[PDB]
Paper text:
Each GsuK subunit contains two tandem RCK domains, reminiscent of Slo K+ channels. We demonstrate that GsuK is a nucleotide-activated and Ca2+-deactivated K+ channel and reveal the structural mechanism of multi-ligand gating of this double-RCK K+ channel and a distinct pore opening mechanics. Ca2+ stabilizes the closed gating ring by binding at the inter-subunit assembly interfaces and deactivates the GsuK channel. While both NAD+ and ADP anchor their adenine rings at the same site on RCK2 by using the conserved nucleotide binding motif, they utilize different functional groups and activate the channel at different sites.
Residue numbers in the entry:
A (entry chain B), C (entry chain B): 18 to 564
B (entry chain A), D (entry chain A): 18 to 261, 350 to 481
Amino acid sequence: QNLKVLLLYCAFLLVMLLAYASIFRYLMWHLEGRAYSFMAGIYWTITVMTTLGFGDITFESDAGYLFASIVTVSGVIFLDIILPFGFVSMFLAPWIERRLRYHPTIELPDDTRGHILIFGIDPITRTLIRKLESRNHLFVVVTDNYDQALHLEEQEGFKVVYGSPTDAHVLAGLRVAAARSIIANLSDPDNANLCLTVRSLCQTPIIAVVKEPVHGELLRLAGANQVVPLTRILGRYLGIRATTCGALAHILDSFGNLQIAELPVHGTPFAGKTIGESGIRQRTGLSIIGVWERGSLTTPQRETVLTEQSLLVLAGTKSQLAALEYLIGEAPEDELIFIIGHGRIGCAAAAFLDRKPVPFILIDRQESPVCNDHVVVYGDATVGQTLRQAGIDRASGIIVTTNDDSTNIFLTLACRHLHSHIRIVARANGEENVDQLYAAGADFVVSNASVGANILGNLLEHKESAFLSEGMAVFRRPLPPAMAGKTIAETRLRPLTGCSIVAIEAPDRADILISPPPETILAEGARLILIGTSEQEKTFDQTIAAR
Amino acid sequence: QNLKVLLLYCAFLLVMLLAYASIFRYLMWHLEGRAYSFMAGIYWTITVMTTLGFGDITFESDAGYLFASIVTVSGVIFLDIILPFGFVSMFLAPWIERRLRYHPTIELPDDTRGHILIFGIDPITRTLIRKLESRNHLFVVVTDNYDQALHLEEQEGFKVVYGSPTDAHVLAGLRVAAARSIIANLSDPDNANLCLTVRSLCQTPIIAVVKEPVHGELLRLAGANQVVPLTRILGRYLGIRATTEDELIFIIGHGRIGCAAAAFLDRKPVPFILIDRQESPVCNDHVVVYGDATVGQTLRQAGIDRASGIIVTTNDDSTNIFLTLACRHLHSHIRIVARANGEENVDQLYAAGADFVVSNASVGANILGNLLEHKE
Amino acid sequence: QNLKVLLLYCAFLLVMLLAYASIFRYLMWHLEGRAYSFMAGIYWTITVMTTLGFGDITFESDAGYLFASIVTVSGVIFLDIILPFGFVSMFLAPWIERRLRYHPTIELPDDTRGHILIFGIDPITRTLIRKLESRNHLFVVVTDNYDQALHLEEQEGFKVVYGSPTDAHVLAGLRVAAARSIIANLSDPDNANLCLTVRSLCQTPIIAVVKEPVHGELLRLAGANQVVPLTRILGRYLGIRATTCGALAHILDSFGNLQIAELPVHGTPFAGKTIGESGIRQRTGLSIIGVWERGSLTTPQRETVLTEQSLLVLAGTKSQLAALEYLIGEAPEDELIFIIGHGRIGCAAAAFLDRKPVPFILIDRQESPVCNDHVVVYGDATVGQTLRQAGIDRASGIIVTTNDDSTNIFLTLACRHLHSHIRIVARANGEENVDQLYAAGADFVVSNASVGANILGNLLEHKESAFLSEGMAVFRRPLPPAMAGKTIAETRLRPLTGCSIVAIEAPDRADILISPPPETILAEGARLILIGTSEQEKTFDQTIAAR
Amino acid sequence: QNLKVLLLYCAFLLVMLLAYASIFRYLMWHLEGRAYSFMAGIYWTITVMTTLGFGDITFESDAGYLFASIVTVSGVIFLDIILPFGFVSMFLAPWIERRLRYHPTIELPDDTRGHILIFGIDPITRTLIRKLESRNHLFVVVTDNYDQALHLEEQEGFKVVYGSPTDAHVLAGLRVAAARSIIANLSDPDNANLCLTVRSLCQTPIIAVVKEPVHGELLRLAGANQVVPLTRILGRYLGIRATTEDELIFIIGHGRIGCAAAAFLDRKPVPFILIDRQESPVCNDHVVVYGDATVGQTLRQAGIDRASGIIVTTNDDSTNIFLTLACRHLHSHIRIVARANGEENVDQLYAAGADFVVSNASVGANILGNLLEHKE
Ligand SMILES: Nc1ncnc2c1ncn2[C@@H]1O[C@H](COP(=O)(O)OP(=O)(O)O)[C@@H](O)[C@H]1O
Ligand SMILES: Nc1ncnc2c1ncn2[C@@H]1O[C@H](COP(=O)(O)OP(=O)(O)O)[C@@H](O)[C@H]1O
Ligand SMILES: Nc1ncnc2c1ncn2[C@@H]1O[C@H](COP(=O)(O)OP(=O)(O)O)[C@@H](O)[C@H]1O
Ligand SMILES: Nc1ncnc2c1ncn2[C@@H]1O[C@H](COP(=O)(O)OP(=O)(O)O)[C@@H](O)[C@H]1O
Ligand SMILES: OC[C@H]1O[C@H](O)[C@H](O)[C@@H](O)[C@@H]1O
Ligand SMILES: OC[C@H]1O[C@H](O)[C@H](O)[C@@H](O)[C@@H]1O
Ligand SMILES: [Ca+2]
Ligand SMILES: [Ca+2]
Ligand SMILES: [Ca+2]
Ligand SMILES: [Ca+2]
Ligand SMILES: [K+]
Ligand SMILES: [K+]
Ligand SMILES: [K+]
Ligand SMILES: [K+]
Ligand SMILES: [K+]
Ligand SMILES: [Zn+2]
Ligand SMILES: [Zn+2]
Ligand SMILES: [Zn+2]
Ligand SMILES: [Zn+2]
């Protein structure tokens, strides 16, 4: 806006120069009978407006004096007054204001399209923003907290809009209809308010982070396209790690046709072994769709070594998972898990361990305001003897799940020093503490920030097939001998059936190809894993038989 | 003010020009025997004070040199020093004390007349201002809270004054005597203070919004012209909608309004159940079940199944929406009457499953509006 | 500092002008054989430094060119660079800093003498400062609260120093030794800390406002020259006003020789009557040393009318006060005083009423943290029925003493409307509410702010005879017939005895002259009231008999 | 940095001058057949770019006019626009971001070496810095509290960094690897976090101040080189002074230090009485009389009459002074040992009536000082 005003002024200046130069020649002629060239006219007019004033060309008439004077004042006005004033008002004042006084962004420009609206800032969403700023996605966080909007604009890896997240006028200004996605990370009541409100304007996909798993149905009702029970998921993860030996954890039941389950490898026979050596696919009929270790979901190779901290992601039928549990097989007796911290996550961990069930003890300094189902040992786990008196000694595992990382580090530090034998699973509230938790002696660390972001991020990047894969089922099919040699693009499975190929695995290998390219040549006896509607899964073996 | 001093300066300049032009001609004549025209004196003086310096017209005498030096230094003092120092001191300084450091208005212009003072800004009064904008009144809201004065400075269809509502010196700079009307929407003790204070200065009509209907008489006594028991009115509105045996009405929220609702259902009578997360500080005529309506089995363990009606009356609209959603989810047909604290939430309450929605802001503003128009 | 730097620059500029002018003439001569005058030299040098450049006087030599150039650059540097920069750095930058950013005054300049140090800001001291700013006394308030020091510098009717009030380094910077007086209005422990600390530096008189009357001796021990029990005094004042009829309140016992007592006139026979009509001096032998009414301690005239709100200040012997109490004389039965608010002042009021004693009831919403001696009826006096249930009906008086003026107004409003008969005494925390308390129906209002300031102010203005009148006694003497006609300055009572004349009263009048001028002619039979040491009160009748 | 750009500009100017002076001579010659000296070219160019404009040397040709116009516009662009815009943009802007809006230091210069990091500023560490100033170390204190960073910016004999003490990215910009020593004076859990974090970057020696002596072992385990149990030391100091039957010692204040004092008197043994206004959150081996030592009969109703010694150990120095005064007032000769939290109060405690005064700041600093010098 300002460079235009700047150089539009330069246009006016230039036109003024020509005009005065032209009139200068006109007057020198008609008033004094002197002829000057165009260059002389420019030269004189510059000399005067610029106040150099050589004096080698002057008028002698009064009318020439009046004109010289007019041109002279014009220079003083348009080079010594307007120009610096224009500068101090179009450049300096705006900058000094924005740099001395926070001016809240109330509204998003009309043209904004395909942006990600973030409602409710916290470690999870802060980590999300940093993780997808590495992709340079357009993130707008929205807050109704003035002191917060300030703080977020100074280290702005993101634009901030200050406004009530539940006003439709605000949402309109945020251009929610034009938005790509929306993360709803407010309280459950505010989220409910937000979804209903956004839904009154648009059909933009909303991802809600629910604080109490029972409110999930309620938030879908309000209009959330996806609901993520973080504290439950986080508790579940502190849970599967706390047992002395690893154990299956069912993730998705895709109609009873295909199950997805995860298995931590600690304490299991598979620990220390390589994948093909453990022979899981051969003995279970399961598919290993990935090895999550060190924060990276990698694809399974035969020579890939499973460590105590590894976690297998598995897919197969209900009976194939039962075979795996037999191979493990039987849990050790007198398992006793101390869960320090009885907030939402601590509660979630205990609730997961009760699903099995595994004997646990909850400790917290205060009584839960939300839970009435769990008996808790009240005490400060930091003040001496409190853990001892709770029977920390006959414990086989400690989950340390406090809202404070330093306390978690300190507890992990102490427990591992007094009980070098037992399993220690620690909660990291920020990723800046994960390493020290390990250094303190924790066997595994669950990092809320990254886990939360990994989920939300994947729901975001796989959005184009998220609400597609929502209501749809993932299934597995033995590659029919008819296509033993043909390529994916040649078979044309999608325009006939409507399903997609998300995995191919070899008949006698633990090696699987994830999301195969259309030029992939299909081998004989191979096993396909597909995803599609519950009307395309039945119209598969039908349509594939017809053509 | 800035224009006058600036153009008063231009006048002094213009005088100084004519002065120097004339002295120039006078000296040129008497000192050097040269005759120059009036236009030549202007042109020369402009030429020298502007530092152009053509040099085509110069004195040759010492006295002419001395004069020329004086006019040169004048141009510098008055165009290159004072004029720019003028700019900065005169109107770059107002820009700092009004744009870099927030300066709240502590007084209205002496001649302010016909304005409606607002004491106690809230959804109701904010809705009132944004409702009567087509009549174009000058609404002035008054707060003694700096941060609130600051936030109300940008969100505007109204002016903000900052000072103690109960200070007579503050009300005078507010020009109460010349105001059209006062809306007193502070606490009952504060309103009483305000009325008595205003009544010591003037007879400006006051509309007081009262929290406890028993205090209505006291507020009229302090000097309020009208008294509006909004919470009683709002509660009566909810109770009316909850009905028009085995009839049982669940009233979630036992604040002042939910209380008014139950006070209403007492007269019918229709049996009800009050739930609140707190013991009431002002009431002890009603039996309340304590608990957070949001947490869990709280509503079930209060017996919300054999209820025939539900009134949602929390001071928080998102809570209201959430409860409405949850109740409509559990029981597809049970009559739900819901409270909207701000009119921004009215539609989501309906979308949540409510059968009728009482809109506090809209109801308050209408009463207050119809009181501002009909009384004045 | 800056105007000196400003015009010292103008000196350098001027010297530069002369120098260049002189050299200009020197060079025109020796380099070109041209002679110019001094005026021509000034004229040329100004023309060039100022960049006018007429061109009617130029050099032709190269050395003349070099010189013209040097002078030219000098003007650009010293009129176009230095001068505006010097301005933007000595004028603009300091102002913009002080006006955009609060710079705390850490220290008082060395030369500061005779200033009043204020430690502990509140309504009392805020009122004090405004009351003695009308005298233009030098007030420095000291605070260790940053956010407060800011707030006080914007509406500065006073300089603010930001610092720990108990650091001797701070006190040294405050120049406590050079100070006139010091008001110690911190907590009792901080005050104790302050006195001891100040006393380690100087002997500057300290006035301490004690929060708990029992700590008074403790604070004198620490070094306070004067101790003021505000809450006790304030309670006492709500107390003497709450009874249905006025009653003597003893103030000072000057060794048993002379007592000072105050008497509110409400309910007494003296109400409605004029002073000489009530004939108090004649019937009691007392002196009426003043009539406090409407915030003004006036002198008593015979025709002065006593109203229900008046308060007599009285002086005389123990027996003369007993005579007055008989004249009153006997209090009405079934007195019942409701005291709403049981903080320090409320407690003080009850404690005063117990000195008599008068039956009272204390009401408060919380239990006192400091008092264990008073039985209190717990309740919110605002929520309905609470007062009724307390038996507010058989009350003869209500003291309303809450920390909140609006609540006091509202209570006063309600009580007077439900009980138009009973005595209502209200507490005003700020003077901006005193009038409305009266308008609400209060019979008398005690204004903490003004009362506090009136006391502190008088201890300050009478400082030159405060620590003098501290340890000294005030006494009254019948004017001996020997001086029946002589003038004060002629008697020479001070250089003989050492006492002072602070009052003269006529033999058959209620008219008294306060602080008589030395030219006063003494009448026959008159009664003198004097003040002096307990060694000059005995060496009075001795020295006055000898000469 | 500002000097270089500024004087690099002067160089460009000087080049431009010589350039224009030479072109001037060249054009004057080839275009007009006039020969001018080098000095004449400087003088002319200075005359034109500076807008003086003597006019004694002017071209007569169009090409000479065009050139003169170019040099004139150059003077304006480079002396009346860029140079002043240079001033403001180059060093009037740093003045706003460093003097009108506080900018905390979030990182130390890359080459910072030999500095002592302070984590947890308090009277002890503040006394430590102001004590070792004669050795002239570069003390850097680190806070994660903005307002505290701000206040510590003015009160200085030390530098202030602002960031999370337990962030590895923050400790790296703090150049821990090249630091002389670290004083860890946060809470026990925070100290543990800090040690482990520092130990992942470097082997810089750490002196941790520990609150609960049982946690000493844990802190060494986390990586602290020395562990200092100050509160135990301070309490032992008080208990030593309270003594060197019917001996009974009143210990006012049952925080960590007063506890340490009583833990000390247990070993002798000398019977004592603890008074505190609160139940201890960390202790339950000692019996405590609850009450505020200041309020009233509290000390008498605890039996402070038959006490033979009194230890004042409150976290507040004015409270300590006040109690000492009151105790010395009641009993003229009873041994009183008093705690000074900051050394500013040591003398008033003595003036209050104390027999011995333990100065936390002075004792802490000496230990920490003698640990900084002797270990390094
Ligand atoms: N030292 C401690 N000992 C026992 N419990 C603690 C301690 N410190 C914190 N806690 C508890 O840990 C819980 C924190 O969990 P919270 O953040 O509130 O929910 P969530 O479990 O989902 O993270 C709190 O309830 C808190 O009381
Ligand atoms: N989740 C909740 N469950 C039960 N009561 C609630 C809940 N949230 C708010 N409330 C109650 O709503 C009341 C607010 O009262 P108020 O705004 O004065 O009028 P109303 O009668 O409409 O509730 C409070 O007493 C508060 O305790
Ligand atoms: N509505 C009320 N009903 C009863 N007591 C009240 C009410 N409001 C305030 N109070 C009490 O009045 C007392 C205020 O006195 P406070 O300022 O604390 O000491 P002081 O008596 O010296 O002024 C408080 O203890 C407070 O509890
Ligand atoms: N007026 C008081 N009466 C009794 N105890 C007090 C009083 N003021 C402070 N305290 C106590 O002093 C204690 C402070 O403990 P701390 O600073 O950790 O070390 P210390 O052992 O020296 O007291 C607190 O427990 C606090 O309750
Ligand atoms: O510059 C003025 C000019 O005006 C006309 O065009 C004349 O023809 C020309 O001779 C003259 O030079
Ligand atoms: O201005 C220069 C002057 O120098 C000497 O003083 C000469 O005597 C004088 O003739 C000349 O005018
Ligand atoms: Ca860390
Ligand atoms: Ca809404
Ligand atoms: Ca008032
Ligand atoms: Ca001190
Ligand atoms: K010329
Ligand atoms: K010229
Ligand atoms: K010029
Ligand atoms: K010029
Ligand atoms: K010129
Ligand atoms: Zn639970
Ligand atoms: Zn009720
Ligand atoms: Zn009491
Ligand atoms: Zn202990």
